[PDB]
């Protein structure tokens, strides 16, 4: 309450506590911090979306993520689109993104794992998923989180679009398909090396500001900035990252749990019985976070080295914590 506005002044830092949050709001970080995101940055006059419109929208999403699943419920959501629109603030990015594309990258990241079942895109297809079925194996739970973001804008009373122009919707959705696609991990390797070729030929205004000529270059920055937001656990304060690594483990055994009870194979990492919490962490950073977030920092320079430090210090804690 008191302690609500306190935690809401780190709003545009990365050292916000969104655990916090979660504690003063009756348990609606997404609401909560979509609402401080939106206020912040004035979307709401911009775009013409009434208060109440958008709070019930909000509420309705928040509701359709689940709380029985350990990490990937409403609190993850909260997290990527306030990591998300730190990220938008960056320096080298300042007068780069029209506001239709600010909107549409924290929309993403707000509804970007909306309804998911706490088990992977691998699991839906070996177990026969109506939803593996559905969307024929390929980014199963991605294609399904958008499918539900957009279909709780149908009824009036939650179309915070309502207002925009029917070209500015078009491109809205467009970036917002494009962007939730992209946190699919089976694309991290292409998305990767595509930023790495961006970074290459990197250009500037003299200003230390980025030169992005048209969608082409603006979309692939959004894409993989969500999915740093998204994969960003790590570069957070030591006490956030191991909170954040204890939830996605309790996702993981139970995973490896599930798949025990019915004699398929059990993925090293979701094996309880056998896997390391430490040295997993150490390989994520080694393999994924830190070639991912060292290519972002090269990108945005030096506007990502505290992050970049916090990362190899939070990757030593996790080192030195294994024999
Ligand atoms: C804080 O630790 C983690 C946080 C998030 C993730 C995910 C990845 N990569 C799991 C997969 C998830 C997805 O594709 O649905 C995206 C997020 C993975 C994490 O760690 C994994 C499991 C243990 C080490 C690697
Ligand atoms: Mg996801
Ligand atoms: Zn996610």
């Known amino acids: 309450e008191d302690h609500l506005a306190k935690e809401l002044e780190d709003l545009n830092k990365w050292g916000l506590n969104i655990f916090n949050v979660a504690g003063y709001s009756h348990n609606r970080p997404l609401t909560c911090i979509m609402?401080?995101?939106?206020?912040?940055?004035?979307?709401?006059?911009?775009?013409?979306?009434?208060?109440?419109?958008?709070?019930?929208?909000?509420?309705?999403?928040?509701?359709?993520?689940?709380?029985?699943?350990?990490?990937?419920?409403?609190?993850?959501?909260?997290?990527?689109?306030?990591?998300?629109?730190?990220?938008?603030?960056?320096?080298?990015?300042?007068?780069?993104?029209?506001?239709?594309?600010?909107?549409?990258?924290?929309?993403?990241?707000?509804?970007?794992?909306?309804?998911?079942?706490?088990?992977?895109?691998?699991?839906?297809?070996?177990?026969?998923?109506?939803?593996?079925?559905?969307?024929?194996?390929?980014?199963?739970?991605?294609?399904?989180?958008?499918?539900?973001?957009?279909?709780?804008?149908?009824?009036?009373?939650?179309?915070?679009?309502?207002?925009?122009?029917?070209?500015?919707?078009?491109?809205?959705?467009?970036?917002?398909?494009?962007?939730?696609?992209?946190?699919?991990?089976s694309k991290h390797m292409s998305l990767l090396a595509d930023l790495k070729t961006m970074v290459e030929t990197k250009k500037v205004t003299s200003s230390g500001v980025l030169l992005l000529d048209n969608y082409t270059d603006r979309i692939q920055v959004l894409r993989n900035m969500v999915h740093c937001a998204d994969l960003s656990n790590p570069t957070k304060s030591l006490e956030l990252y191991r909170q954040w690594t204890d939830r996605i483990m309790e996702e993981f055994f139970q995973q490896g749990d599930k798949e025990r009870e019915r004699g398929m194979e059990i993925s090293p990492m979701c094996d309880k019985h056998t896997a390391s919490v430490e040295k997993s962490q150490v390989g994520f950073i080694d393999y994924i976070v830190h070639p991912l977030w060292e290519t972002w920092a090269d990108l945005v320079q030096p506007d990502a080295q505290d992050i970049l430090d916090t990362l190899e210090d939070n990757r030593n804690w996790y080192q030195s914590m294994i024999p």
């Open 35 to 185: 609402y401080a995101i939106f206020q912040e940055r004035d979307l709401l006059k911009t775009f013409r979306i009434s208060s109440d419109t958008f709070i019930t929208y909000m509420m309705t999403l928040e509701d359709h993520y689940h709380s029985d699943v350990a990490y990937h419920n409403s609190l993850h959501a909260a997290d990527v689109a306030q990591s998300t629109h730190v990220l938008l603030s960056t320096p080298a990015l300042d007068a780069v993104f029209t506001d239709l594309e600010i909107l549409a990258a924290i929309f993403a990241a707000a509804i970007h794992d909306v309804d998911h079942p706490g088990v992977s895109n691998q699991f839906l297809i070996n177990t026969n998923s109506e939803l593996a079925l559905m969307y024929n194996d390929e980014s199963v739970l991605e294609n399904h989180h958008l499918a539900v973001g957009f279909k709780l804008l149908q009824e009036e009373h939650c179309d915070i679009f309502m207002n925009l122009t029917k070209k500015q919707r078009q491109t809205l959705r467009k970036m917002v398909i494009d962007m939730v696609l992209a946190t699919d991990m």
